[PDB]
Amino acid sequence: MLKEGAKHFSGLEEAVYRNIQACKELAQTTRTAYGPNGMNKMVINHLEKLFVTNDAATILRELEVQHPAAKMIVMASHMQEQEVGDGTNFVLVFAGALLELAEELLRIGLSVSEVIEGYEIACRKAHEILPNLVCCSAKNLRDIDEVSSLLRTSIMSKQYGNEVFLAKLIAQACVSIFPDSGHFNVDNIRVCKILGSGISSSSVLHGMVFKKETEGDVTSVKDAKIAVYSCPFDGMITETKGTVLIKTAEELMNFSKGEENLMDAQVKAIADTGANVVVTGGKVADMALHYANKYNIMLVRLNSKWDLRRLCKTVGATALPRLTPPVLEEMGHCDSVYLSEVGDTQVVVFKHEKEDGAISTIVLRGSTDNLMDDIERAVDDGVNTFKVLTRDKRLVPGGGATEIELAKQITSYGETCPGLEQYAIKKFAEAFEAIPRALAENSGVKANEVISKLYAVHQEGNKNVGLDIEAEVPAVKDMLEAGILDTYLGKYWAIKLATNAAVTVLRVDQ
Amino acid sequence: NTKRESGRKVQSGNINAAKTIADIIRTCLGPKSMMKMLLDPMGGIVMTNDGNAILREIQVQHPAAKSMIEISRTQDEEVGDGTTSVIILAGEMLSVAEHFLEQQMHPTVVISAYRKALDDMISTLKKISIPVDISDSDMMLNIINSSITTKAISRWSSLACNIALDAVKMVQFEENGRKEIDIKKYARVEKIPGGIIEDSCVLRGVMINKDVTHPRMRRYIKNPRIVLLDSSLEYKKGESQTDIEITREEDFTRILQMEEEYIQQLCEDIIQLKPDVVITEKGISDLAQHYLMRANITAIRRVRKTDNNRIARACGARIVSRPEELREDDVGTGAGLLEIKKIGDEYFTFITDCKDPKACTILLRGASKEILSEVERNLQDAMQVCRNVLLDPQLVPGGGASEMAVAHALTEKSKAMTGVEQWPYRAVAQALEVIPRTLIQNCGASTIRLLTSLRAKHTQENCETWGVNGETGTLVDMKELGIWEPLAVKLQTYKTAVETAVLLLRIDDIVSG
Amino acid sequence: MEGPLSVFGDRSTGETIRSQNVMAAASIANIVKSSLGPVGLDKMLVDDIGDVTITNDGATILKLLEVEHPAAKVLCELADLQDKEVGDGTTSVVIIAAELLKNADELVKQKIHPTSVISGYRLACKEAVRYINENLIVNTDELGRDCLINAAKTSMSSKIIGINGDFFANMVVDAVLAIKYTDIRGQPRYPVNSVNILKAHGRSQMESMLISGYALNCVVGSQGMPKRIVNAKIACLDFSLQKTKMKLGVQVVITDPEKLDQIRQRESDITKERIQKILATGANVILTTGGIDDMCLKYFVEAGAMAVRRVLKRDLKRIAKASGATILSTLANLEGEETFEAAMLGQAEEVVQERICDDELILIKNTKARTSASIILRGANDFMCDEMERSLHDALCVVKRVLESKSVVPGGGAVEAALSIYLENYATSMGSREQLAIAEFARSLLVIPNTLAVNAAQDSTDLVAKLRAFHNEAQVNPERKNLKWIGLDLSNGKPRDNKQAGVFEPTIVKVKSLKFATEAAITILRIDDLIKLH
């Protein structure tokens, strides 16, 4: 400060300006990133590799700002993304939008608590009236449509057109195997992206899909006792002496054969422990391969940790470098453990089917990684939006036909509840228009034009914005029934969530 | 030559001046008051509550301020008051609307909102505008003293009450068309120097300071009859133009004196006739005017015909060639009072005129020659009520609860009018409530909460009649508090205010000529 | 400037000055854009410093403005020349010029018979003028369903303050015929401004009363003297009565003031004999010119006279010819001693005094020597009458301009929207140079309405979306009718459904604005070589 002491970068103006303004910075694109999104975002992640998406959290985590303002709220956006797969595209914009009313009320001179608390009780009032606007509930996981109907909404809230083949393909991955009652799992259903085939060739093989080359034979048994190992081959040939191969002419003789019998004992000890599939994040060797061909134990030549991880995760396997006779601790899990060609890529396939614990493994055949990973992104955040763990998701208008109802609900009521809080309560019903704007953003019209008509749709729950021109000229697309609703819950959090950090990040002048 | 200006840039320049002008005077206007003190480059201080007085003494910026002086005048041109209101009121709607609305992008409903925000005033006012008896000096006095107080002055109010309560009723045009609302020549306030408050002596008719200017003139003839020219003055305005002579030095002196010795012979031609007053639009010279006075004939000189005509009807003066030569005499009496008042030996002849063409030029007397100027302003603001009450008995009580009364009825109607239109209409709904809230922010505490209380008060209790006190800040009935906000004034204010701000948006461009 | 600075004298030698021209050309037309159409903003424009002018008329704007370049200069003529044409098309001609003079040179530079290039912007005008002669599809006062009634009603819908256009549709019909004056080429069209029109406060806000014959406004309430005997006749006078000095020629300089008082005393009393000379001729209504002094007035009030004075000479002149009277016959002098003969008497079925609205008029029933009418306007106040009267005037000139040219167009660049893509098509098969010009022509057309659109904040994307959608090969067709909508309402900025509206323009100003626009493409180009002077 004035004094050489007082560590801080936040406060006073730079709070009522820069913090909120820095909060404004990132919500800018989240607008283009939520609901139907025609917008796209190049990102290099410190691979210098471009990637394209509409999602903030993928990007924001990378982005580094002086100020915890940005650094905090993402956690809530994560806290959403943790609990709810999508809407996080939205979860940031409303707070940042709702915030900047304060700095205005600060120019209008409204106190911290005064500005805060109006949003609060209105947020409770929201949390009171928000479930009143539950317009449906989900029903059946076994039904593909009942699932896929919703799933578009989040895929929509990532990317618009693709959602159709996708949402179906998702419940066709059997979101249904899990009850979605107190349980559901990504890693069991895990996306596995095959570069090649088509992007709409993205398929479903229930049970593990490992793009890794499937070696040896097929597993000794399909129940396979599965000993997965980080690097069970560090080489059994040693790299030593002169040439980084040999030094003395007598050296080479012992280098070549030693790999064999060690790996022979190693792959015998794979059979000795009884592993019916051998998984080497370490190298593949033809002898060991032929040993794995002799002992008939299916071989995995190379592993991402994700391989080992999931194998460690799902099978109950434990990946360990073995220069060491393998010992089954990993043991088995999956009742059918296969070789397969999916995308006609050699696909390491383990499968076991259980109401909980079943791997129903999303296999994305795809033409482009940079797409198929963003194609993964929406289905990810779509099935994570499928993750509610209420089979009946108490659905509310998806793509936000809600806000117009609530923008009507609160600020009207907002004045009824009196005192300067009312203005914060009335400011509360404003930033609803964000996604109606944020779609009209990527749709290309004015939120006023939107809201004026979508106030003129009055009590609806249905008509609202979207993509194309029906979010433009009428600003009317049925966001109850385009087939698009959203769960009350993912909605319920964003208000609740974006209530907290927004309220919070204002309070802090240091 | 050709010059081009564009977009927000000028319209923001429009925003700046009037708004910045709207600052001090809004605090100045009303019982809650401040002073705008101009710094002359020499350090000269000029502090007023009239910014238009300060604005002129220094550079007037073109974009907002050049039009605001004129909408300052126009309001004061019309009713006789309100330079300080329209500017801050136009500054209100100018401030928050366009950029916001132009960030919502349209010039149209902005301009269109002024209309429909203007009539909601007209709508909610005349509903809650409270009628007052126009035959009652007092029922007019409470609304007139409210409007005589425009800045600080209740002092001459009660005294400016009585004169105007009397005068504007007697006001008639020379058409005598209607009474009531009037031109300030058919109600004139001429401050008469010196004396004391006792000499204030309400004058309902025209005064002629030139009727009796001298003690030697006509002394108190109850009905003065001004005889126009025509024979009593035969017409010679010319000069003999006598030939040049180098011998006499007097020929240089005498030829110029010949001009005024003609009217002398014409004033000699007057004497025989003894018109008790003589009016000459050609004018009479003073060397000619000697011989009129000694006759006990007063002389109105260098006055026009309409000045005389309205008076010749007001004082009821036969207008003839000669008193003995028939031009068909006008009446002998048009008036009931001829009072010639003297401060010094310059006599002030006041003829109180009842429903006459006259001028209704009203006598005021301050304690001296100076505080007259405020009495005149007091009287003009007083006669403004008396022309407004005799126009509108209904005039809104408010401490600016009227300045809320529209604003909240707007947001009510914003919900009714809808469209994209509501958003300008709801944006311009905000601008009105600031002026009084500033006055009750001049008070203190939370002025927006008082405004919230206002808004809570507004549709619940009453818009304006019941309202907030301006200087106290309490929510009170403004007729009960006695603060009166003339309907026409308010009617004129936003009207005059909405008009200028329409063009300020319409102008993104000026040239150099 | 731009590029080479090496030579003064506005010699930038090619594209530089050419662009410095298109700069100046795009510089001047800008005010017009924001001023284009009735939705064009109104520009307060400083004349000196405190001296200003508030004008939305680019031509008027231009007239205050000065021309700092030939590019600035060549437009400020053609714009004021199209203003000099009518004043319809002022803003029109302005803008398109700035686009075409980067378009014009680009082709005409390449020579290869250099003559005919900008005619690609000319033959297009022809191509347009023809089509512009073809548009009754919108803007018809040529005939409506009620014709000039509904034509004015839709024009009173084009300017509409109220339900006016009920009587006011008929008034404009009454108005064009109220005026009867020699008009050439054989026009039954008669000037719509000269229509005797009177404003009436009170009664109904929206209402009108047509006076049989011209309605002469005659002073009442000032002169209390009776002018009134119900008669068949009026004495139309250009003459004046004064009780101060009726006939001059006396000098205030004379040593005798008696000379000025004498003719004053005598000729003050001759004022009331002149009427007695007129009344004895059989004239019980005698229309006299005013000018009496405020003293002479009250004298004429208190002394009294029989005569109709201070009448409107605009009407008195019209009625003199109308009732067959003259305004002067036996009048050789300013003396009231003059006899009266019936030559100044107007002949009528009856001259009857009807005071209505508390305004007495001289209403000549059966004006004999011509056909005459006056439509008085009943309104709350005369401002309310000012309100509809102006709404009536653009129900008039449109009919007039239609009575000027039966062939018309819808006003605005909507006729371009048809023509433009058509002329771009009319360019297409031409190819070569010629696909460029006529298309480089027609693309530069589009600026007018779209700017006029956004001037109304109409989302110029809309204006093109609506019009050139309807415009097709399906509809290349103006027809006389709407199978497409080629219309654009100017005060709306948006195409409406009004096909009769009075805010449009005929084929008159539009065939002009094309060529003037093609001109500025040429107008700057005539200079041969270039130089600089010392």
UniProtKB/Swiss-Prot annotation, chain A:
There is a cross-link at residues 211, 241, 247 (Glycyl lysine isopeptide (Lys-Gly) (interchain with G-Cter in SUMO2)). It is an enzyme of class 3 (hydrolase). ADP binds at residues 34-35, 87-90, 156-158, 399, 486. One of its GO terms (biological process) is positive regulation of telomerase RNA localization to Cajal body. GO terms for cellular component: azurophil granule lumen; cell body; centrosome; chaperonin-containing T-complex; cilium; cytoplasm; cytosol; extracellular exosome. SUPFAM superfamilies: GroEL apical domain-like, GroEL equatorial domain-like, GroEL-intermediate domain like. The modification N6-acetyllysine is found at residues 305, 387, 453. GO terms for molecular function: ATP binding; ATP hydrolysis activity; ATP-dependent protein folding chaperone; cadherin binding; protein folding chaperone; unfolded protein binding. This is T-complex protein 1 subunit theta. It comes from Homo sapiens (Human).
Swiss-Prot record, chain B:
CDD domains: TCP1_gamma. It is found in: Cytoplasm. The keyword NAD does not apply. The modification Phosphotyrosine is found at residue 235. The modification N6-acetyllysine is found at residue 210. Component of the chaperonin-containing T-complex (TRiC), a molecular chaperone complex that assists the folding of actin, tubulin and other proteins upon ATP hydrolysis. The TRiC complex mediates the folding of WRAP53/TCAB1, thereby regulating telomere maintenance. As part of the TRiC complex may play a role in the assembly of BBSome, a complex involved in ciliogenesis regulating transports vesicles to the cilia. NCBIfam families: chap_CCT_gamma, thermosome_alpha, thermosome_beta. Belongs to the TCP-1 chaperonin family. This is T-complex protein 1 subunit gamma. The gene is CCT3.
Swiss-Prot record, chain C:
Mg(2+) binds at residue 88. Belongs to the TCP-1 chaperonin family. GO terms for cellular component: acrosomal vesicle; cell body; centrosome; chaperonin-containing T-complex; cytosol; extracellular exosome; Golgi apparatus; heterochromatin. It is found in: Cytoplasm, Cytosol; Cytoplasm, Cytoskeleton, Microtubule organizing center, Centrosome. This is T-complex protein 1 subunit alpha. The keyword Phosphoprotein applies. Changing residue 7 to L: In a breast cancer sample; somatic mutation. The modification N-acetylmethionine is found at residue 1. GO terms for biological process: binding of sperm to zona pellucida; chaperone mediated protein folding independent of cofactor; chaperone-mediated protein folding; positive regulation of establishment of protein localization to telomere; positive regulation of protein localization to Cajal body; positive regulation of telomerase RNA localization to Cajal body; positive regulation of telomere maintenance via telomerase; protein folding. The keyword Transport does not apply. The modification N6-acetyllysine is found at residues 199, 400, 494. The modification Phosphotyrosine is found at residue 181. CDD domains: TCP1_alpha. Its EC number is 3.6.1.-. Component of the chaperonin-containing T-complex (TRiC), a hexadecamer composed of two identical back-to-back stacked rings enclosing a protein folding chamber. Each ring is made up of eight different subunits: TCP1/CCT1, CCT2, CCT3, CCT4, CCT5, CCT6A/CCT6, CCT7, CCT8. Interacts with PACRG. Interacts with GBA1. Interacts with DLEC1. The gene is TCP1. Pfam families: Cpn60_TCP1. PANTHER family: CHAPERONIN (PTHR11353). It is linked to Intellectual developmental disorder with polymicrogyria and seizures: An autosomal dominant neurologic disorder characterized by a broad phenotypic spectrum. Main clinical features are developmental delay of varying severity, intellectual disability, seizures, and polymicrogyria. Additional variable features are non-specific pyramidal or cerebellar signs, and visual impairment. ATP binds at residues 37, 89-91. One of its GO terms (molecular function) is RNA binding. The modification Phosphoserine is found at residues 6, 491. It catalyses: ATP + H2O = ADP + phosphate + H(+). ADP binds at residues 37, 89-92, 158-159, 412, 505.
